[PDB]
Design a protein around this ligand. Sequence first.
Ligand SMILES: C=C1C[C@]23CC[C@H]1C[C@H]2[C@]1(C)CCC[C@@](C)(C(=O)SCCNC(=O)CCNC(=O)[C@H](O)C(C)(C)COP(=O)(O)O)[C@H]1C[C@H]3O
Ligand SMILES: [Mn+2]
Ligand SMILES: [Mn+2]
Ligand SMILES: [Mn+2]
Ligand SMILES: [Mn+2]
Ligand SMILES: [Mn+2]
Lengths: 356, 356
Amino acid sequence: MEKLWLNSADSHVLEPDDLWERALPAALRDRAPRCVRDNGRETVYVDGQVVRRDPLDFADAMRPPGALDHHIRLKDLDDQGIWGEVVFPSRGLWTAVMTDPVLARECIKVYNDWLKSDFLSLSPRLVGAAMVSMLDTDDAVAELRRAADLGYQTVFLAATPPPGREFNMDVWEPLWAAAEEAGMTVSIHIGTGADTVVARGPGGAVINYVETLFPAQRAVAQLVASGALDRHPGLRVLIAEAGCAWVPALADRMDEAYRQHGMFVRPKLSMLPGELVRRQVYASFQHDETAIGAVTAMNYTNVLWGSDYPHLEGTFPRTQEVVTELFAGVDPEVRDLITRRNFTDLFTVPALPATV
Amino acid sequence: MEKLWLNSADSHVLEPDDLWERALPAALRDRAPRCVRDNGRETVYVDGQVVRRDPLDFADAMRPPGALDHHIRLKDLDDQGIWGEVVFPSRGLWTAVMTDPVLARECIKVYNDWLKSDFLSLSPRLVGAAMVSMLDTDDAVAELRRAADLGYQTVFLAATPPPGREFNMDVWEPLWAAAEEAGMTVSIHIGTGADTVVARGPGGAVINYVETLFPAQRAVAQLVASGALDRHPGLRVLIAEAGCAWVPALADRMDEAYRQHGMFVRPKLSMLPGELVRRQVYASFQHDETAIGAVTAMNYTNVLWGSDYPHLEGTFPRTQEVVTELFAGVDPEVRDLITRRNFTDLFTVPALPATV
Ligand SMILES: C=C1C[C@]23CC[C@H]1C[C@H]2[C@]1(C)CCC[C@@](C)(C(=O)SCCNC(=O)CCNC(=O)[C@H](O)C(C)(C)COP(=O)(O)O)[C@H]1C[C@H]3O
Ligand SMILES: [Mn+2]
Ligand SMILES: [Mn+2]
Ligand SMILES: [Mn+2]
Ligand SMILES: [Mn+2]
Ligand SMILES: [Mn+2]
């Protein structure tokens, strides 16, 4: 009771520099994501493409020792008063901008085996997101099925899929089925599948942070409007790291178009966009007070807190100071929904007593 | 079963077919916007370009008489219970996709002259939005000042500005300064400027209605992050026809970036993005319940209601029934703020006679 015990729907693991070096067949090794550290600069390379350049200050700001040592991660969880934590890739996210299905498939296979055998094995508190090919449905289905057998509870998809593979297209249907069948949550994490540095004028850093929402919103719109959620009532989707309050907003906007633009709408839905969102679309946030508002005043109950451990955008190391001010004066049942119960609906971890 | 007086922050006027033909030199008059309704299709010509080619339901997408007859429209106000109403262009919006600064400047003049002479003359319950050039700053300032001497209260800007004229750019500063001086509200209406992203697959109607939000969210982010509003505390902005609940969501999103990515953030603001949003950014809606949650639960008081007469996505003929459903068991001080007082803070109309 001397801490508020949280479940985090969002965090990242830094992969071993040599993950793909050691594990891939030799024909693919050089093409895997690798990095050069020189001057103040870390340049990431993927399959003959510079994909990212950061200064070492910011690169290493996201690299506290818990981001590397999984034994320190757990000590940081305890320290933050965090129990459950979903873990998303860092380096493996660049699989989502690969143009070669074979390279992407094999890199993903390597990541999924490492994450389960060398990280998730340390504690049942850690729930892992398995990657699945953004490029080929048969590769993604095969990997999700293989990941389920291994006991994975959720797959990661990039917010921006490859060209012609928008989330409303038929190509995704076999994956939505497999995911529904397997009981498996689809986690779409923002800032992935495309270049995140879109704006370069005055206000660039705030503009770009905003630009990452558009694919998230687009993704919900494509999954609702296409009927994908409607055909798969068991399929539940987590928009991770997008904030929350835009989700009921978008529920209203798709309802207006469904009702007033009825005559141009294809396909028809068994219920309204708003109902599909409120049933099956979850979303995570770190600091956003609007996230409570969406629950109390907009009937959007699918809100989950996340540390985004250990990015700057996240709460670490001030998790307790942050959640304490957010939920200062807030109904205990809503603090519990947002911080604990929505998590345990999506993900299985050992149950804290809700009594303590 | 009694009605209630509302102000409306969004509606449109259909300009005369011959509007620019009759008023422009030879070098010009053939290149101004031409709508053509024929064979179940709506086609729009601008400066040699087909800028739209949309299907029409010759059955269930039929236009209200009052769009086609400006005296049937004022009857439609009285019937719908609407006192003040902001009026935006229809065909005139096409000046914002124009590439020729001369065609744009001169069409804007023809429009601002006509709308005052022949439409706003009908009733001072009408608040006209004057167009100003999206292409040249000197020409945008000229026409704003001219429109102000003419008594215009607000200038229309397109959501998507021309390439290289993003709203974070220094090219707009003269126009912001002039808008503040003039005491003129800046109204950014959505679904205007060069068509950004058209979706083509399943759910296209619903996806395309969501797509038009992104230019608006982007526009607010550009104006907040760039210091435009911070440097101009008397400049006010209305986002017309985008809904509302995403605005506090975007305040939070921008505060997370401002606080957690302070090192990347240029320029600095005198107060947080969310403060500038809550102080200077207004947003309109027609049907969206979340618009009330934004006021009651997210401390966003800059919500206005609009009819969006005569568009399908508007409330006609059910304005009163819609507004009755929305405000059922809602503090009438909030009904008053959203339906009347925000309107009278932005706009001047004749005093509404008291009832009982
Ligand atoms: C492990 C990673 C994954 C990922 C990409 C590389 C790293 C890390 C994160 C990060 C990126 C982590 C911040 C969250 C998130 C979701 C974003 O995308 S936030 C948007 C990007 N923000 C930034 O790059 C930092 C702010 N800086 C900028 O915006 C620009 O560098 C500039 C300030 C405009 C300078 O340009 P210039 O005008 O001076 O020429 C992720 C995406 C994720 O895929
Ligand atoms: Mn994250
Ligand atoms: Mn992050
Ligand atoms: Mn004909
Ligand atoms: Mn409108
Ligand atoms: Mn409209």
